[PDB]
Amino acid sequence: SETKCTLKSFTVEKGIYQTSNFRVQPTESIVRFPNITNLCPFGEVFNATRFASVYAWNRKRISNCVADYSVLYNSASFSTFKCYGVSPTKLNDLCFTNVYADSFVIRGDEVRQIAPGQTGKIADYNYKLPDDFTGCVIAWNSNNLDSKVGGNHNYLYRLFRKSNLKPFERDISTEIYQAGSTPCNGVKGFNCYFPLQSYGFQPTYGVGYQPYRVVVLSFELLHAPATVCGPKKSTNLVKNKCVNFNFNGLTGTGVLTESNKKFLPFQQFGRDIADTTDAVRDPQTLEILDITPCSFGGVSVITPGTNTSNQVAVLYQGVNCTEVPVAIHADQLTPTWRVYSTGSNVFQTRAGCLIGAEYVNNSYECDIPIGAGICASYQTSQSIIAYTMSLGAENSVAYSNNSIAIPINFTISVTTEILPVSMTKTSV
Amino acid sequence: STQDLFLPFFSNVTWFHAIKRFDNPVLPFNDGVYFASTEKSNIIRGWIFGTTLDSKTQSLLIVNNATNVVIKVCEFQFFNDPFLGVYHKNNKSWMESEFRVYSSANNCTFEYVSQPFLMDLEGKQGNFKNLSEFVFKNIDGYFKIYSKHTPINLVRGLPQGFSALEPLVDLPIGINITRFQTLHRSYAGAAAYYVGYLQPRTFLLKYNENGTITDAVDCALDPLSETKCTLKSFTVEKGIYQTSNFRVQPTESIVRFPNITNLCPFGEVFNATRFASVYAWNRKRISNCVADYSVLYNSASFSTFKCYGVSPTKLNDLCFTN
Amino acid sequence: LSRLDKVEAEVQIDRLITGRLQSLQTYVTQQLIRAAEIRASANLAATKMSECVLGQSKRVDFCGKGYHLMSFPQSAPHGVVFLHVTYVPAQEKNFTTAPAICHDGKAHFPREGVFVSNGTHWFVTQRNFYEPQIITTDNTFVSGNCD
Amino acid sequence: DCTMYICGDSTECSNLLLQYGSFCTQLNRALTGIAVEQDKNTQEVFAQVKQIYKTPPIKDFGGFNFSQILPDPSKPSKRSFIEDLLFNKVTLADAGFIKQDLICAQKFNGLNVLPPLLTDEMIAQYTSALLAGTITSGWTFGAGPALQIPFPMQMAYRFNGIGVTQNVLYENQKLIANQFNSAIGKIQDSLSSTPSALGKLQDVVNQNAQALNTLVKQLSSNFGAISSVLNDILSRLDKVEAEVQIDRLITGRLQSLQTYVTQQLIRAAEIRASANLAATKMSECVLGQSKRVDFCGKGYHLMSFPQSAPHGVVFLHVTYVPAQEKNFTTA
Amino acid sequence: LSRLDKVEAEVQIDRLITGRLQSLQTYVTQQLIRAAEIRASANLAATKM
Amino acid sequence: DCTMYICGDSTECSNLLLQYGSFCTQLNRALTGIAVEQDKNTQEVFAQV
Numbered sequence A: 001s002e003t004k005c006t007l008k009s010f011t012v013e014k015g016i017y018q019t020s021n022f023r024v025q026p027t028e029s030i031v032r033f034p035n036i037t038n039l040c041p042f043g044e045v046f047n048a049t050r051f052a053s054v055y056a057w058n059r060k061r062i063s064n065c066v067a068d069y070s071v072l073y074n075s076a077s078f079s080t081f082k083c084y085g086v087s088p089t090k091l092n093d094l095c096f097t098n099v100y101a102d103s104f105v106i107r108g109d110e111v112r113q114i115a116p117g118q119t120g121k122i123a124d125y126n127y128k129l130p131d132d133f134t135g136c137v138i139a140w141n142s143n144n145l146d147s148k149v150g151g152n153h154n155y156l157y158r159l160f161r162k163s164n165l166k167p168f169e170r171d172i173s174t175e176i177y178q179a180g181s182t183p184c185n186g187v188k189g190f191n192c193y194f195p196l197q198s199y200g201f202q203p204t205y206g207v208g209y210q211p212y213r214v215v216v217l218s219f220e221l222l223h224a225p226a227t228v229c230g231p232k233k234s235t236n237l238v239k240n241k242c243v244n245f246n247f248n249g250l251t252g253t254g255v256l257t258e259s260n261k262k263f264l265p266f267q268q269f270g271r272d273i274a275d276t277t278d279a280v281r282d283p284q285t286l287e288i289l290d291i292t293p294c295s296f297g298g299v300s301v302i303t304p305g306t307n308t309s310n311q312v313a314v315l316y317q318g319v320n321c322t323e324v325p326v327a328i329h330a331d332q333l334t335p336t337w338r339v340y341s342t343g344s345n346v347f348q349t350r351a352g353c354l355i356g357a358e359y360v361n362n363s364y365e366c367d368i369p370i371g372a373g374i375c376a377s378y379q380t381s382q383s384i385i386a387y388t389m390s391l392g393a394e395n396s397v398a399y400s401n402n403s404i405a406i407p408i409n410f411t412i413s414v415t416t417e418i419l420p421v422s423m424t425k426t427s428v
Numbered sequence B: 001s002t003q004d005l006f007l008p009f010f011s012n013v014t015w016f017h018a019i020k021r022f023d024n025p026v027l028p029f030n031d032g033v034y035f036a037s038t039e040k041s042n043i044i045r046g047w048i049f050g051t052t053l054d055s056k057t058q059s060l061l062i063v064n065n066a067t068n069v070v071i072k073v074c075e076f077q078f079f080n081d082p083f084l085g086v087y088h089k090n091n092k093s094w095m096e097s098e099f100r101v102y103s104s105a106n107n108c109t110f111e112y113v114s115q116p117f118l119m120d121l122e123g124k125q126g127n128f129k130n131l132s133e134f135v136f137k138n139i140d141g142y143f144k145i146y147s148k149h150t151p152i153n154l155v156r157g158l159p160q161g162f163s164a165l166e167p168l169v170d171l172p173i174g175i176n177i178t179r180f181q182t183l184h185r186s187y188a189g190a191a192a193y194y195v196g197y198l199q200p201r202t203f204l205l206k207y208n209e210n211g212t213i214t215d216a217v218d219c220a221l222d223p224l225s226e227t228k229c230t231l232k233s234f235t236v237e238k239g240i241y242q243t244s245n246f247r248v249q250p251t252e253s254i255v256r257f258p259n260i261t262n263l264c265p266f267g268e269v270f271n272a273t274r275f276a277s278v279y280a281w282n283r284k285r286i287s288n289c290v291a292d293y294s295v296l297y298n299s300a301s302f303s304t305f306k307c308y309g310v311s312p313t314k315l316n317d318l319c320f321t322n
Numbered sequence C: 001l002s003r004l005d006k007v008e009a010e011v012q013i014d015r016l017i018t019g020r021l022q023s024l025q026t027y028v029t030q031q032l033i034r035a036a037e038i039r040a041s042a043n044l045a046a047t048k049m050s051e052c053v054l055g056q057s058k059r060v061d062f063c064g065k066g067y068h069l070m071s072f073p074q075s076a077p078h079g080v081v082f083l084h085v086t087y088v089p090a091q092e093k094n095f096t097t098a099p100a101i102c103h104d105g106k107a108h109f110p111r112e113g114v115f116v117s118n119g120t121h122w123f124v125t126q127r128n129f130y131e132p133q134i135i136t137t138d139n140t141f142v143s144g145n146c147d
Numbered sequence D: 001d002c003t004m005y006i007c008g009d010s011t012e013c014s015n016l017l018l019q020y021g022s023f024c025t026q027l028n029r030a031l032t033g034i035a036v037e038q039d040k041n042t043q044e045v046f047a048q049v050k051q052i053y054k055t056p057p058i059k060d061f062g063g064f065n066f067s068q069i070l071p072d073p074s075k076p077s078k079r080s081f082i083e084d085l086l087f088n089k090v091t092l093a094d095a096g097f098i099k100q101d102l103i104c105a106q107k108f109n110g111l112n113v114l115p116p117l118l119t120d121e122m123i124a125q126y127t128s129a130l131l132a133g134t135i136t137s138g139w140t141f142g143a144g145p146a147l148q149i150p151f152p153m154q155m156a157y158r159f160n161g162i163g164v165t166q167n168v169l170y171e172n173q174k175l176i177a178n179q180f181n182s183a184i185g186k187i188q189d190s191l192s193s194t195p196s197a198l199g200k201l202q203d204v205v206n207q208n209a210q211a212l213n214t215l216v217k218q219l220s221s222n223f224g225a226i227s228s229v230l231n232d233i234l235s236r237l238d239k240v241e242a243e244v245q246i247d248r249l250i251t252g253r254l255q256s257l258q259t260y261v262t263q264q265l266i267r268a269a270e271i272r273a274s275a276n277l278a279a280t281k282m283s284e285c286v287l288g289q290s291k292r293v294d295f296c297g298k299g300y301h302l303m304s305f306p307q308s309a310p311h312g313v314v315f316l317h318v319t320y321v322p323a324q325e326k327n328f329t330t331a
Numbered sequence E: 001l002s003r004l005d006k007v008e009a010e011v012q013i014d015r016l017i018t019g020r021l022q023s024l025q026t027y028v029t030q031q032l033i034r035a036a037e038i039r040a041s042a043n044l045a046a047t048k049m
Numbered sequence F: 001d002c003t004m005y006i007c008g009d010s011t012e013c014s015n016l017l018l019q020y021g022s023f024c025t026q027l028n029r030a031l032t033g034i035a036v037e038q039d040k041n042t043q044e045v046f047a048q049v
């Protein structure tokens, strides 16, 4: 039936038909995250006393703890959530190398200016983001917490600068800017403006001028020995099985074995030529483990003509079929059928393993090829057999230094030959 | 092969020797700075990083004052002659009494004190010269540190050999740095250090089977190395190898815009008395004048800007038919 | 188009155009390769016509298996069929041979044919068909001595 | 394997790949066609005889010594000294005899190498049969029933073929045999000394290896996406905007696969032309004597001998070359 | 580049790059096929010589 | 020249072209192979003496 699927027809011709290749599905799953339990102090970040002004935005280090972004995303008092490189849903399943938390207060209309590649006074002078920023930005109004009727002037930003700042650049200097041509000194002068600009935060201000507390997370991910993870709980590890593993967020599937790679302490991952992972250091046990996806291979179906018979054979190219008994149908396979795995008709070849055919010793002309000199045929009470192909009939010649053989009679034979010459014209 | 900031091979490095009395000069940190030392008893123990160094802007301070290494970034008012001074004072130990480095630390945003960094290796007593190699990068506000320590037995020059640096720590100092000064252990001994300059280049890093860098070649040092980087191999067969094409870079820039000076009447547009209704929407023609879209894009009283076919940023560098 | 207006339609139209253009390009490239193979086959067919049909060929196994005699072309849909007539020997007999004959103290060699004996008498025969002849000087040319 | 290469072990990426139709099926069909064509090439090149001839135990060929081309029974395989040298000079990578190392990275990404139908021992058997048939019966075995003929008379027939009367052989047999043996020894020494000769085969081996290496390396490119690894893309981005990256990855990998397949098709066509030339040379030069100038070697052709090699065949053209001329007066 | 900021310059330049890469690939493939035909003709010329 | 043709004298476009891998290198190799093949053809046709 799978060959009928491949051919999109109800009749199959005599031969071999490669079909959908198999793969061993993982048997179970292992979770190995670092067993830290101390909660990350997001209280001192989101719900602290006061935030440093945008021109001198405070940076608070968070590391070696377990965070849960669900309680931050699910709150209804927040206003905006747009994340770059990450999704709000997928934060709990992944670990962070280091958490750089930037918190500050900006204007309501300047919330757009947080996005990298934008243009505005804040991004131009005191807080610019890299073109490929990764992380999440949190925005919400805090007028009733940081606005006073007499005017809150504790939040400041720079008005002029000599040149655009680099990404993540911080400037503290209060040098007087020389807006005019002539230079000046002192506290103040004509066309000599103080770099910092003040604002009278008051509750009477309408939407678009209200203070909007903003927290930006600029973590970098999965190219380093991460130390901050979600609330996912650890699980015991097993070896020599195809297993759905995930170390520090590295979701993957394969069979793992203790390798001999000497990972240096700043190195956590090992990678192949194709930039795929090859080894990993377990976050709980400091050994090094190789990772390989469990074995797989193609599936070929050996069959005679559909009108002649319905019995078929199966071949597993490139697979030492000692794993086929391990391919028990307790775990599933890409090919659903397994009834041919009964045994007592199993033969190994250099091209793989042939199941469903009886190997014999007598030789014949190669009917339909399998590989590596072995090929099968259907004949006699009839079954699919396998044999080594015969190169021809052996015939020795009687050489001697004084004898010849010359023919006496002749036969005239006629032979046909077919050669394609041309093909149908087509214009599109 | 990696394409990022890297010192060229066979570089004309500036050299120092602490033969007496001497001073440490200040050198720029443009595009990264390479630093090496073949010294005894860890005479070099710190560096000063910044752009103004005179408390006008922030600066970086690293000192290894015996007990531990201190990393501090503040509004430092460094002294004009920073030095460290220390022997056998009734304890058989050597103490560092002087820490005369700065006078003012008004506001500090980044501090770190863990342990001292005089990680001397095998051999002891300085039988073989110790090569402490350092490379510092300041990219997008991140200060990255790499360090090494290896023994050499060459008398005076840089050891002819191959080595690579492990990363030490990443510092989010986020300050402007254009120059730097190095630190010292004043007590009988001579010390030398190199001051190289990192550059954005590419090298072919030959990792061994064990994961240690054994050799490296440049992609633009000389034609042979360019062929090596092009072929991604350390052996070259006899023949002719086409490499990266050259192009003459322009010598200078020329700006030629029409020499009209009268300001455009955008006042009569935005700050006009009244507008025509939407059904009879008004049209005004503006030409032969000087405009500036920056004053339109920088106002905070506006609500929406959707520019199609053009960005608001590139308006001042473009000219309009009508 | 009947569901989406122009601005959001162009998004889907461009994807469809790219997909169909890729399919067309793949088809054209495959057709070019097949055409090259067909040109090779047609050149071989033309050479076979010119050498086997219009003449007699000495090239081994080119115009059929055996010693070539003639050929006849026949048409076919998008092709051509040749009928190679060849000469094949059938029955052979084993004999005793000798490279030369020393009669008057001089070596004798066949002008055409081979020396052959059935066990008691010697004859000369052409190589591809048995026809004994009495040894004659018309059959042999003399050169050198018998040592 | 198109599906593993593009979207290895990912149902979400497999569903997106499903939207593109039969690209994977077309690629698989082309690759299968090439694979069958290789066996067809080898079959036509080496299988020109249906009966395996065996050399006689006696080695009295009138002074000619074929020890350097006949198989040596002591070795487990039927390979002669020269064939041993040819198999030694070539560094064949990844023959595919069950890989139960760069070739390991290729295999785990869906890149399979299939074994040839005819083995290196069966090819040697075919070559030995051809060589024994030639040295025993001249050209008659290729035209019909095999007819035995002394070698000292077959060479006289060859000289008659090249327009030289036959008595020249019967008067210079010992010297001619010495020349032939010395020439065979010189071939032995040249093939044991120089290495640039088999560059014609090492080149195609290197081309295949480098093409597979480039195809493997192509998986590391972002193709405009935020990352090159679909597992991290899924683990960071949910089911909505992950599409915007996965479609770019799928398009890039599809272009890489198509380029690889097209280049493979062109290379296969070139190899088919070369194999047709090799079969024509076998039929014209080994099974008979050819009058075509500079076809079977430089000079007047006498005979040839085939020798197997990794992914190729080696011919030894024996030719007649005049050496010492004298000026005369003519009319 | 002189009209649009970097963010949308990405969206334009990637399209331009894809188109130009397609044109280059088509040119190279056609040249390869033409070279194969010319090589066959050169082999025929050598045999005729 | 792949980079000249696609992104002539633009560092921003060169950076984007860098993301696509070895397409340019493959094209250059194919063109160099064709160029060498032409000289091989001429040599084998004309250099028989």
Ligand SMILES: *[C@@H]1O[C@H](CO)[C@@H](O[C@@H]2O[C@H](CO)[C@@H](O[C@H]3O[C@H](CO)[C@@H](O)[C@H](O)[C@@H]3O)[C@H](O)[C@H]2NC(C)=O)[C@H](O)[C@H]1NC(C)=O
Pocket: A162, A163, A164, A165, A166, A169, B051, B176, B177, B178
């Ligand atoms: C980090 O500090 C750097 C050192 O002060 C600073 O570079 C300085 O930038 C100013 C502003 O342009 C330059 O001042 C000169 O500018 C032009 C030359 O382009 C002249 O026409 C002016 O008249 C004026 O002289 C300084 O020359 C320049 N300093 C150096 C050593 O080149 C950077 O801009 C600072 N970076 C940040 C992000 O703040």
Ligand SMILES: *[C@@H]1O[C@H](CO)[C@@H](O[C@@H]2O[C@H](CO)[C@@H](O[C@H]3O[C@H](CO)[C@@H](O)[C@H](O)[C@@H]3O)[C@H](O)[C@H]2NC(C)=O)[C@H](O)[C@H]1NC(C)=O
Pocket: B065, B066, B067, B068, B070, B113
């Ligand atoms: C080497 O330089 C170090 C950097 O300044 C310096 O560290 C300083 O150490 C003192 C005492 O160890 C600290 O003073 C405070 O220390 C703890 C902190 O809880 C308190 O118990 C003390 O009473 C006191 O408040 C300084 O804060 C600390 N400096 C910094 C910047 O943190 C070392 O002491 C220096 N070593 C020598 C030998 O001079």
Ligand SMILES: *[C@@H]1O[C@H](CO)[C@@H](O[C@@H]2O[C@H](CO)[C@@H](O[C@H]3O[C@H](CO)[C@@H](O)[C@H](O)[C@@H]3O)[C@H](O)[C@H]2NC(C)=O)[C@H](O)[C@H]1NC(C)=O
Pocket: C118, C119, C120, C121
């Ligand atoms: C090898 O071939 C020889 C040539 O044919 C043959 O010799 C021939 O033998 C026949 C006998 O069958 C002779 O024919 C004569 O036979 C008797 C002999 O008395 C006569 O009465 C007949 O009338 C007839 O003339 C041939 O004359 C004779 N020819 C020659 C040249 O000798 C040998 O017998 C053959 N040997 C073998 C072993 O087959």
Ligand SMILES: *[C@@H]1O[C@H](CO)[C@@H](O[C@@H]2O[C@H](CO)[C@@H](O[C@H]3O[C@H](CO)[C@@H](O)[C@H](O)[C@@H]3O)[C@H](O)[C@H]2NC(C)=O)[C@H](O)[C@H]1NC(C)=O
Pocket: D065, D066, D067
């Ligand atoms: C046909 O040619 C063969 C190759 O030239 C030749 O075999 C060679 O024979 C010589 C002498 O018989 C060997 O030389 C060695 O012989 C013995 C071996 O122990 C030693 O006593 C000698 O000192 C010397 O080392 C060659 O080694 C051998 N060549 C090979 C490749 O084995 C045949 O003898 C020739 N046969 C005829 C009939 O001419």
Ligand SMILES: *[C@@H]1O[C@H](CO[C@@H]2O[C@@H](C)[C@@H](O)[C@@H](O)[C@@H]2O)[C@@H](O[C@@H]2O[C@H](CO)[C@@H](O)[C@H](O)[C@H]2NC(C)=O)[C@H](O)[C@H]1NC(C)=O
Pocket: A396, A397, A398, A403, C092, C093, C094
């Ligand atoms: C011609 O002779 C060969 C062999 O020579 C013969 O050997 C003896 C049998 C004897 O008859 C001698 O006088 C000859 O010189 C024949 O080859 C043999 O063929 C038979 C089958 O008929 C076979 O069983 C033998 O094995 C073959 N010999 C060898 C060495 O393998 C050949 O058949 C003879 N031809 C005819 C038409 O009879």
Ligand SMILES: *[C@@H]1O[C@H](CO)[C@@H](O[C@@H]2O[C@H](CO)[C@@H](O)[C@H](O)[C@H]2NC(C)=O)[C@H](O)[C@H]1NC(C)=O
Pocket: A320, A321, A322, D098, D100
């Ligand atoms: C196929 O696999 C089996 C086992 O997985 C191989 O049998 C092993 O052979 C080696 C070499 O003789 C022995 O050292 C092992 O002890 C065998 N294993 C077992 C379980 O018996 C077998 O060799 C493999 N097939 C091939 C062709 O290599």
Ligand SMILES: *[C@@H]1O[C@H](CO)[C@@H](O[C@@H]2O[C@H](CO)[C@@H](O)[C@H](O)[C@H]2NC(C)=O)[C@H](O)[C@H]1NC(C)=O
Pocket: A056, A172, B106, B107
């Ligand atoms: C850096 O430190 C200085 C001094 O500690 C701060 O300047 C003081 O700011 C307060 C607040 O307005 C004034 O009352 C003082 O008079 C200032 N002192 C001096 C000497 O000018 C400065 O604010 C700090 N920088 C930041 C960014 O907080």
Ligand SMILES: *[C@@H]1O[C@H](CO)[C@@H](O)[C@H](O)[C@H]1NC(C)=O
Pocket: A042, A043, A044, A046, A047
């Ligand atoms: C801030 O206060 C609210 C309201 O009491 C509380 O729900 C929230 O948890 C606080 N913030 C943090 C980070 O805990």
Ligand SMILES: *[C@@H]1O[C@H](CO)[C@@H](O)[C@H](O)[C@H]1NC(C)=O
Pocket: A034, A035, A283, A284
């Ligand atoms: C995890 O727990 C084990 C057992 O208590 C402990 O040995 C190990 O150190 C822990 N992991 C880490 C990273 O400390």
Ligand SMILES: *[C@@H]1O[C@H](CO)[C@@H](O)[C@H](O)[C@H]1NC(C)=O
Pocket: A307, A308
């Ligand atoms: C298959 O068998 C049926 C019935 O025996 C016959 O009609 C049909 O022609 C056969 N198929 C072919 C291809 O001949």
Ligand SMILES: *[C@@H]1O[C@H](CO)[C@@H](O)[C@H](O)[C@H]1NC(C)=O
Pocket: A359, A360, A361
């Ligand atoms: C074939 O022969 C071998 C030995 O000659 C023997 O071991 C094997 O069992 C035979 N095969 C069968 C199917 O009998």
Ligand SMILES: *[C@@H]1O[C@H](CO)[C@@H](O)[C@H](O)[C@H]1NC(C)=O
Pocket: B012
């Ligand atoms: C290095 O630069 C100095 C100062 O320009 C110069 O004197 C010296 O010759 C240079 N050396 C080399 C090797 O370039």
Ligand SMILES: *[C@@H]1O[C@H](CO)[C@@H](O)[C@H](O)[C@H]1NC(C)=O
Pocket: B089, B090, B091
């Ligand atoms: C010796 O060490 C002690 C304790 O470390 C210290 O109090 C004392 O001052 C030291 N001696 C001198 C001379 O400084």
Ligand SMILES: *[C@@H]1O[C@H](CO)[C@@H](O)[C@H](O)[C@H]1NC(C)=O
Pocket: B266, B267, B268, B269, B270, B271
């Ligand atoms: C409108 O008036 C404001 C207030 O003085 C002024 O700043 C602005 O420039 C005027 N509009 C224009 C287009 O100049």
